[PDB]
DNA sequence: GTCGG
DNA sequence: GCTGATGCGC
DNA sequence: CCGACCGCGCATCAGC
């Protein structure tokens with residue numbers, strides 16, 4: 001919050017490029033600049049001071065001087081006044097509605113929450129659930145509640161098969177005092193990169209959590225990735241908790257470390273780290289880290305026995321989860 | 327929009 | 332039906 | 342300059 005004004009402005013600009021302009025690289029440039037600045041231990045005094053940081057260039061420098069001078073940015077001022085842009089940005093806030101669908105909805109005269117509700121027929125499954133819990137998904141999750149959720153998930157999974165290992169990742173594993181949702185990494189000895197000895201490994205867990213009424217809805221579901229909704233049980237007479245977004249990712253047991261690295265994030269941390277790996281001649285995904293051949297083709301997976309091993313391969317000093325929040 | 331070669 | 336591209340999300 | 346910008350699972354569609 002030291003440079004909150006500036007980072008907020010950059011994020012708004014990032015969201016505009018992504019949602020309205022559909023310019024992903026500009027979106028990421030703004031996000032990176034915001035990220036690099038939010039980590040800066042000094043209260044920025046000029047765009048010049050900011051341009052010193054990698055990720056901030058001439059354009060963002062100028063915008064920072066304007067913001068520092070007036071306390072706002074005219075470019076954004078005009079974007080907020082723009083109806084089409086305003087409507088498109090709003091609609092993308094519904095899970096399942098992206099830049100394309102939002103712009104398409106606006107063309108059809110569907111621009112508001114009221115319009116969406118009276119046009120459910122025009123939404124796919126994911127979008128319907130997104131609209132259903134629109135308000136709830138905007139809410140933050142206190143770490144206290146994350147702990148209760150963790151307890152339920154780990155205990156329910158244990159009941160299905162004592163061999164399952166569920167790990168809560170995302171901002172929770174990074175030590176955040178609140179999270180936007182729950183991310184669960186799941187492993188089972190029967191599912192490795194070498195073979196899938198038992199089917200429905202993910203399904204069984206999903207089924208068990210729906211059975212005890214923890215999982216309430218599904219946005220999408222496959223062999224290794226579940227994307228849905230959950231809710232903590234409330235006591236008698238007490239208002240019920242808000243519904244929460246939950247993702248469960250089944251990863252090969254022998255590829256746990258690359259999996260937990262990926263799922264722990266942050267997303268920008270992953271991007272920076274993956275980009276650095278490339279520069280160092282390696283490629284990283286949630287399954288492995290492989291070297292890049294002379295022509296640029298990925299090679300065979302390298303042995304990994306801890307998250308640190310991955311960091312060493314790319315010549316990075318180990319960074320604890322709590323320090324990966326970029 | 328920013329960056330490295 | 333399958334394969335490939337695209338949207339969307341993590 | 343100028344092109345590279347992380348990598349991938351699921352849902353949906355187009356074309357066959």
Ligand SMILES: Nc1nc2c(ncn2[C@H]2C[C@H](O)[C@@H](COP(=O)(O)OP(=O)(O)C(Cl)(Cl)P(=O)(O)O)O2)c(=O)[nH]1
Nearest residue numbers: 170171179180181183262263264265266267270271341
């Ligand atoms: N490589 C890669 N990994 C990603 C990406 N997006 C997400 N991940 C990985 C890294 C992410 O940590 C993880 C979970 O996705 P979230 O739940 O979206 O991210 P959280 O960090 O949990 C959070 Cl702070 Cl947005 P919140 O607490 O509010 O949920 O997935 C991406 O674009 N790329």
Ligand SMILES: [Cl-]
Nearest residue numbers: 023024025026
């Ligand atoms: Cl772009």
Ligand SMILES: [Cl-]
Nearest residue numbers: 285287288301
């Ligand atoms: Cl792989």
Ligand SMILES: [Mg+2]
Nearest residue numbers: 170171181183
């Ligand atoms: Mg999360």
